[PDB]
């Protein structure tokens, strides 16, 4: 089984760094012009193998019928905010509504991710994010693409949400 995962959220919240931690297991820039960067990973989750394709969306938002179609191909969505960016957190409602629109359903597998949890500059509190997530009936995971904390769990937990659809 294949899973199409889509990572969304506001500019600079760490969408690419999360994807890059998942697939490549590092945070510092590497230099390698020989290789194309990969968006596919084979993993075992709860004793069953799967192939994951990750759409790591641009933060810069716009109207696009083709982008809607790229997102429509997604089966589950990580909605990512950064714990030091209150606006990214307030944006999550808008990202949830956009996914509901594109998918034409209220029942879309989704996980809330609060990234950059290694930072000294927290402005959004765990409890606050837990409540939004509970309000939506979806799981909540805090992550750091720097240290890799939560990174597996975020994508794997989304897969778990797809398996219950």
């Amino acid at each position: 089984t294949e899973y199409k995962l889509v990572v969304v959220g506001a500019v600079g919240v760490g969408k690419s760094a999360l994807t890059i931690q998942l697939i490549q297991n590092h945070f510092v820039d590497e230099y390698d012009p020989t290789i194309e960067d990969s968006y596919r990973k084979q993993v075992v989750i709860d004793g069953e193998t799967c192939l994951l394709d990750i759409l790591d969306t641009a933060g810069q938002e716009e109207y696009s019928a083709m982008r809607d179609q790229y997102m429509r191909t997604g089966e589950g969505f990580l909605c990512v905010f950064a714990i030091n960016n209150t606006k990214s957190f307030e944006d999550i409602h808008q990202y949830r509504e956009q996914i509901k629109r594109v998918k034409d359903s209220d029942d879309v597998p989704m996980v809330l991710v609060g990234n950059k949890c290694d930072l000294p500059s927290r402005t959004v509190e765990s409890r606050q994010a837990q409540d939004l997530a509970r309000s939506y009936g979806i799981p909540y995971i805090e992550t750091s693409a720097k240290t890799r904390q939560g990174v597996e769990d975020a994508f794997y937990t989304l897969v778990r949400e797809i398996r219950k659809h």
Binding site: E36, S38, Y39, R40, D53, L55, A58, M66, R67
Partner: peptide, 29 residues
């Protein structure tokens, strides 16, 4: 822009290419 996968390409080679194309086409809209 990802390089075309080739005529020797396995099904798995094509999935890898596809996931790349997906990200590319989204990014350049």
């Amino acid at each position: 822009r990802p390089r075309c996968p080739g005529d020797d390409a396995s099904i798995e080679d094509l999935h890898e290419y596809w996931a790349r194309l997906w990200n590319y086409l989204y990014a350049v809209a």
